[PDB]
Amino acid sequence: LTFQKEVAERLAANTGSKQRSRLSVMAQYLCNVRHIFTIPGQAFVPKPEVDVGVVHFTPLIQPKIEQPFKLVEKVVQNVFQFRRKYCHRGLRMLFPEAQRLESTGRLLELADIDPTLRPRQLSISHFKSLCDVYRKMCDEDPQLFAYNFREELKR
Amino acid sequence: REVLQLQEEVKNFITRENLEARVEAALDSRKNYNWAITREGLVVRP
Amino acid sequence: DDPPPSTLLKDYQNVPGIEKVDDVVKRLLSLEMANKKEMLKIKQEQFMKKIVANPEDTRSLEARIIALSVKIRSYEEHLEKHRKDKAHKRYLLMSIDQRKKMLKNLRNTNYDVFEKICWGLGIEYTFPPLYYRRAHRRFVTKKALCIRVFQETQKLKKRRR
Amino acid sequence: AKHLKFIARTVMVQEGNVESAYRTLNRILTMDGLIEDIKHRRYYEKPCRRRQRESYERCRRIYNMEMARKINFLMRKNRADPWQGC
Amino acid sequence: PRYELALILKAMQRPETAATLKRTIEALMDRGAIVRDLENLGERALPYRISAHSQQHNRGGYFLVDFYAPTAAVESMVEHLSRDIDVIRGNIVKHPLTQELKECEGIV
Amino acid sequence: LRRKVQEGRLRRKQIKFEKDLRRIWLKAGLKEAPEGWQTPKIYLR
RNA sequence: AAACUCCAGUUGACACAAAAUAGACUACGAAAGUGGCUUUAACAUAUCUGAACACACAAUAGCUAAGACCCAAACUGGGAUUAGAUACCCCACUAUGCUUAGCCCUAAACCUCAACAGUUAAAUCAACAAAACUGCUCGCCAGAACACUACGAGCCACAGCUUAAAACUCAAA
Ligand SMILES: [K+]
Ligand SMILES: [Mg+2]
Ligand SMILES: [Mg+2]
Ligand SMILES: [Mg+2]
Ligand SMILES: [Mg+2]
Ligand SMILES: [Mg+2]
Ligand SMILES: [Mg+2]
Ligand SMILES: [Mg+2]
Ligand SMILES: [Mg+2]
């Protein structure tokens, strides 16, 4: 597929590439992603102000996280919502306020994740551990997976 | 000259001895700080 | 130490009959009922009487040094309470540099007055460093090792001889 | 809120001429700058844009006043020709 | 230095006003002040409603206390004026007379 | 991958610093380092 | 259209938020910056120049802990939109904008005018910008790109900031 240059780099960003964001992990725990080459904007007949990258996806035989897609999406989005802050600041928004401090510590303790890791420095195995522990928490609490902290702040 | 003026002025200052008298006298008094100015630059007192 | 609060203002100290006034007048014309600047002026006058040969000539190097020393003390007192006042920290550092320059000039020009100023104002003159380079971690570590190794070599040579 | 009411921005109607009273109130609010403040406070004006706008308005006023003064000064000369033919 | 305390007191009867004035001046002297004069501007409607000490005031008595105090007293006095319940609003300023009336030659 | 190379270079720099420090006392004649001397890790937080 | 209907109007009580008019003023500060009121401290230097690194500061953004939260708002949701819709409109709500104690050290940080002293006589003067110069000092520059780059070194920064090349290539820029 062709994407914009920035989106292609974010899709093909390694652990510790500035374009490392949600799309990087989201694409990479399921596919081998290769950003092959870039086309400058002058080559398109009505010339845009952006470049175009060409990315190749090959589905992975063994996905790096054995979890439902929407759960992983929620975990990754909440991790990356504050991309320059510590990771725990992003994980703590997955839980209601009352159980926020306790549940965040529990998740980090069971997942074996250093709280001082930033979102851009989290490998896919760290996300595997976080997703597994979050799945256990959601199984132990039916209504956790439907929590949206913005709606809680509306009240 | 300034020191002498201060000497004469100190005699009228409020002290712990004359606090009641001066307070009552003030309560029996009124001062007006308001005055207006005309287009010609003349003060108009109330 | 500061002048006592009962001290009269420099402006009202030589007025004739100023000892024949009411205690209220004395308080009104004292440092207790004035701003810090009058107290600093009294400090400067005290230093001038104590140190300089002619306490009236304020254009000499020693008088300027005394005045800037009083100002530096005032800035230090201000910054003791106002830790985050960057402007006054700058003013203090610049005043210290200026006083160092004046002290260098006085030392090069008049040593007796320089010594009298240093004793009277409690200033310990320090010579500038010869080189201005960053003492980074590697440099300090290597220098410490060199000093330690020299000490060990001295011990070994003493034992040998 | 804490002030007495029906004193600020209040106009009395004369002979039931409500239209004239409303228009006089509009004139008052316009010449006191309240209308411009209300219209400008709908959306936030960034400080740099506000500074540029104020500078432009001030210098436009100065330039217009100078040009008007020049035109009025040179208007005295505009009259019938006294040496016509030569 | 020389200071002027502008006091807006609660609209009370004469005995209470006299007691409050005595208390204020006593606090001033207890903080080291030499009071010059106590001056009454009158009881008048406030320019606006003032809510002080959980009570709303629309009228008040205006008084001026001229005094000489050390620089350290002012802050302390302010605290006292915050605690007194009969003072609607007390404010200490540098006395206007101390400011020098610099002369002017006119518009250049 | 830029992290790994940088960390390896930092290890190499620390090794070079230690090696120079060792050269110093070896040339001074001391068979070992001065008593209680331990080269600090100045290039790592 | 979604949204709210614990909604909306009058009245009363009520901020850790930012400060109409004055300001058509052009002031204070080394710069960055500074425009609600009172008070206390307080704005170096009686030659000038003098640092990427020494010593102290540096808008906005960004990061640690704690706290506050009206409004605004990166992102994140929802509503409406052609025929690949509006990225742009609407609603809700985050980081952040605020305070305390530390970091980070960058700006079209610009008057795009290096600091002091002097001159207006000259030929005024490539052009434009902002009239043309002189004396003295520090800093910097010697074709383009490679290159606000690589390596080395340093740094509370760990991708960051400062300093900063070479090979190949071209007749230009
Ligand atoms: K500019
Ligand atoms: Mg200098
Ligand atoms: Mg240099
Ligand atoms: Mg900064
Ligand atoms: Mg900030
Ligand atoms: Mg918020
Ligand atoms: Mg912001
Ligand atoms: Mg310079
Ligand atoms: Mg670089």
Swiss-Prot record, chain A:
Domain of life of the organism encoding this protein: Eukaryota
Expression by tissue: Ubiquitously expressed.
Induction remarks: By the nuclear respiratory factors NRF1 and NRF2/GABPB2 and PGC-1 coactivators.
Annotated compartments: Mitochondrion
Effect of R84E: Abolishes the interaction between 12S helix 45 and TFB1M
Quaternary structure and interacting proteins, as annotated: Interacts with mitochondrial RNA polymerase POLRMT. Interacts with TFAM. Bound to the maturing mtSSU until the late stages of assembly.
Further details from the record: It has been proposed that variations in TFB1M may influence the clinical expression of aminoglycoside-induced deafness caused by the A1555G mutation in the mitochondrial 12S rRNA. However, this was later questioned as patients with the A1555G mutation had similar 12S rRNA methylation levels to controls.
Main function: Mitochondrial methyltransferase which uses S-adenosyl methionine to dimethylate two highly conserved adjacent adenosine residues (A1583 and A1584) within the loop of helix 45 at the 3-prime end of 12S rRNA, thereby regulating the assembly or stability of the small subunit of the mitochondrial ribosome. Also required for basal transcription of mitochondrial DNA, probably via its interaction with POLRMT and TFAM. Stimulates transcription independently of the methyltransferase activity.
UniProt family annotation: Belongs to the class I-like SAM-binding methyltransferase superfamily. rRNA adenine N(6)-methyltransferase family. KsgA subfamily.
Encoding gene per record: TFB1M
Curated annotation (Swiss-Prot), chain C:
GO biological process, one term: mitochondrial translation
Main location class: mitochondrion
UniProtKB keywords: Mitochondrion, Ribonucleoprotein, Ribosomal protein, Transit peptide
Molecular function terms from GO: RNA binding; structural constituent of ribosome
Compartments it resides in: Mitochondrion matrix
Disulfide-bond pairs as recorded: none
Superkingdom per UniProt: Eukaryota
GO cellular component, as recorded: mitochondrial inner membrane; mitochondrial matrix; mitochondrial small ribosomal subunit; mitochondrion; nucleolus; nucleoplasm
Family note: Belongs to the universal ribosomal protein uS15 family.
SUBUNIT field: Component of the mitochondrial small ribosomal subunit (mt-SSU). Mature mammalian 55S mitochondrial ribosomes consist of a small (28S) and a large (39S) subunit. The 28S small subunit contains a 12S ribosomal RNA (12S mt-rRNA) and 30 different proteins. The 39S large subunit contains a 16S rRNA (16S mt-rRNA), a copy of mitochondrial valine transfer RNA (mt-tRNA(Val)), which plays an integral structural role, and 52 different proteins. Interacts with METTL17.
Protein name: Small ribosomal subunit protein uS15m
Lineage: Eukaryota, Metazoa, Chordata, Craniata, Vertebrata
Gene transcribed to yield this protein: MRPS15
Full-protein positions shown: 65 to 225 of 257
Curated annotation (Swiss-Prot), chain D:
Keyword Chaperone included in the entry's annotation: no
GO molecular function: RNA binding; structural constituent of ribosome
InterPro entries the UniProt entry points to: Ribosomal_bS21, Ribosomal_bS21_sf
UniProt-listed GO biological process terms: mitochondrial translation; translation
Listed transmembrane segments: none
Keywords: Mitochondrion, Ribonucleoprotein, Ribosomal protein
A GO term from the CC aspect: mitochondrial inner membrane
Localization annotation: Mitochondrion
Main location, first listed in the record: mitochondrion
Family per similarity comment: Belongs to the bacterial ribosomal protein bS21 family.
Quaternary structure note: Component of the mitochondrial small ribosomal subunit (mt-SSU). Mature mammalian 55S mitochondrial ribosomes consist of a small (28S) and a large (39S) subunit. The 28S small subunit contains a 12S ribosomal RNA (12S mt-rRNA) and 30 different proteins. The 39S large subunit contains a 16S rRNA (16S mt-rRNA), a copy of mitochondrial valine transfer RNA (mt-tRNA(Val)), which plays an integral structural role, and 52 different proteins.
Name assigned to this protein: Small ribosomal subunit protein bS21m
Organism field: Homo sapiens
Gene that encodes it: MRPS21
Swiss-Prot record, chain F:
Record carries keyword NAD: no
GO biological process, one term: negative regulation of mitotic nuclear division
Places the protein is found: Mitochondrion matrix; Nucleus
UniProtKB keywords: Mitochondrion, Nucleus, Ribonucleoprotein, Ribosomal protein
GO CC annotation: intracellular membrane-bounded organelle; mitochondrial inner membrane; mitochondrial matrix; mitochondrial small ribosomal subunit; mitochondrion; nucleoplasm; nucleus
Description of how the protein assembles with itself and partners: Component of the mitochondrial small ribosomal subunit (mt-SSU). Mature mammalian 55S mitochondrial ribosomes consist of a small (28S) and a large (39S) subunit. The 28S small subunit contains a 12S ribosomal RNA (12S mt-rRNA) and 30 different proteins. The 39S large subunit contains a 16S rRNA (16S mt-rRNA), a copy of mitochondrial valine transfer RNA (mt-tRNA(Val)), which plays an integral structural role, and 52 different proteins. Interacts with Aurora-A.
UniProt record similarity statement: Belongs to the mitochondrion-specific ribosomal protein mS38 family.
Summary of the function given for this chain in its UniProt record: May act as a negative regulator of Aurora-A kinase, by down-regulation through proteasome-dependent degradation.
Protein name listed in UniProt: Small ribosomal subunit protein mS38
Organism of this sequence: Homo sapiens (Human)
